[PDB]
């Protein structure tokens, strides 16, 4: 889809590491609902790859 | 009258002028609820003046 798929790699393996799933269970990185939002607020409708 | 100070003492001297008044009462030129639109769809969110 959208660009080089080395990229879309590295995110993947990233995503799917052993160590990567550990860092996910000691969580102030819980990415929390509000955290979530004040993301999500930022975007505007101009340029939102999607 | 012919000043070329800025344009927003030109638009606004403009909208009190009398004979502006008159020419708002003979009407192609009364803005359509649709007319309206079909200006204002056009914008884009992105770039904007509001």
């Known amino acids: 889809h959208l660009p ?4 879309q790699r590295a995110a993947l393996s990233l ?10 269970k ?6 929390t609902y509000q955290d ?5 607020l930022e ?3 101009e340029a939102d790859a999607l």
Chains 1, 2 share one sequence.
Do not use: G, N
Not at 4 to 7: G, I, R, V
Not at 15 to 24: A, D, N, P, Q, S
Not at 36 to 40: A, G, I
């Open 15 to 24: 995503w799917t590491h052993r160590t990567f799933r550990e860092v996910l």
């Open 43 to 45: 975007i505007q409708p």
């Open 36 to 40: 979530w939002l004040h993301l999500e």
């Open 4 to 7: 080089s798929a080395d990229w």
């Open 26 to 31: 000691e969580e102030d990185v819980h990415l």
